[PDB]
Design a protein around this ligand. Structure first.
Ligand SMILES: CC(C)[C@H](C(=O)NO)N(CCNC(=O)c1cccc(C(=O)NCCN([C@@H](C(=O)NO)C(C)C)S(=O)(=O)c2ccc(-c3ccccc3)cc2)c1)S(=O)(=O)c1ccc(-c2ccccc2)cc1
Ligand SMILES: [Ca+2]
Ligand SMILES: [Ca+2]
Ligand SMILES: [Ca+2]
Ligand SMILES: [Ca+2]
Ligand SMILES: [Ca+2]
Ligand SMILES: [Ca+2]
Ligand SMILES: [Zn+2]
Ligand SMILES: [Zn+2]
Ligand SMILES: [Zn+2]
Ligand SMILES: [Zn+2]
Lengths: 160, 160
């Protein structure tokens, strides 16, 4: 991000404001957990689920206009969007409830794969030129380990 | 791009190498000239159709691996791509023909809107951060004028 936005503490907490009705509540729970663990492993940061709106990364599902004045757009297209590291809406991540959300092998979009990407933005990662990476802004389904040299080099540029 | 690549001659030529069967050849050429007519007005450049490989911007359709080593991906995902001005393959614009090319409201990706974006890339524009611009790297069908200030600030920066 412009001016290299990054967290200035290591215990990044997340709150899930709501759940989509495509998956069971707890599948989605795990789906997010694993997405953080993708980043906890390569960062000096740790990720703590909490139940409090003072959480760093607040997470929600939502259709069209949903608060930030950055409305979604129906089926397909915008999958989800995440804001840089900072106070308030910064850090958050929303998922277009008009997209069918599921886990890999499902017809719909991988909530884990899309959550993986969103959380990288929340950590200060923008998009990557490398078409094979996670922060590459084109969702291709993958059963292989979603991180790649470029996602990790980015995140090490930020938090060491 | 990082070096701000541009043309170094004002009278650009173009060759429509091969055709999709999605449209008429006569509509495709016209679609094509109508996208050069977005960039001809706002620049010192003219855009002359030739019938030669020695053309500056060579337009070809292709599936998967197709000569440039930047393969496509079946229907959806990639629509097309172009390379900043320069010799040979630079300036060229390639259309994934695993996409139903069309015009207007309905099925298909408008070859005209798609080409306009493509042809601004071949003059050396990158993508635009402004979600309503032609050079926004996301396709939304509009029946309105595809050129916005940001796009015109773009090529003015290169040539104007
Ligand atoms: C908040 C937004 C911005 C959001 C997102 O990022 N959230 O984090 N969207 C993504 C929208 N795209 C971008 O943000 C972006 C930023 C910088 C560069 C690019 C870009 O290069 N996109 C690819 C465009 N293609 C070509 C191109 O543009 N040639 O000119 C490239 C490959 C050369 S394309 O062939 O698909 C193409 C796209 C649009 C046009 C076009 C546009 C306007 C008019 C006419 C045509 C033409 C070609 C895209 S998003 O759709 O919600 C999204 C997308 C992917 C993922 C993800 C990625 C990896 C793994 C799992 C999931 C998550 C979300
Ligand atoms: Ca959407
Ligand atoms: Ca937040
Ligand atoms: Ca949904
Ligand atoms: Ca060329
Ligand atoms: Ca395609
Ligand atoms: Ca076709
Ligand atoms: Zn939002
Ligand atoms: Zn993204
Ligand atoms: Zn190509
Ligand atoms: Zn583009």
């Amino acid at each position: 991000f412009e001016g290299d936005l990054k967290w200035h503490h290591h215990n990044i907490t997340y709150w899930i404001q709501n759940y989509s009705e495509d998956l069971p509540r707890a599948v989605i729970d795990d789906a997010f957990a694993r997405a953080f663990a993708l980043w906890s492993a390569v960062t000096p940061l740790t990720f703590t689920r909490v139940y409090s709106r003072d959480a760093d990364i607040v997470i929600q599902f939502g259709v069209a206009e949903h608060g930030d004045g950055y409305p979604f757009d129906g089926k397909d297209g915008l999958l989800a969007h995440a804001f840089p590291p900072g106070p308030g809406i910064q850090g958050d991540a929303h998922f277009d409830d008009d997209e069918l959300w599921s886990l890999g092998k499902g017809q719909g979009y991988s909530l884990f794969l899309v959550a993986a990407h969103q959380f990288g933005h929340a950590l200060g990662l923008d998009h990557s030129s490398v078409p094979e990476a996670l922060m590459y802004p084109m969702y291709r389904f993958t059963e292989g380990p979603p991180l790649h040299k470029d996602d990790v080099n980015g995140i090490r540029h930020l938090y060491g």
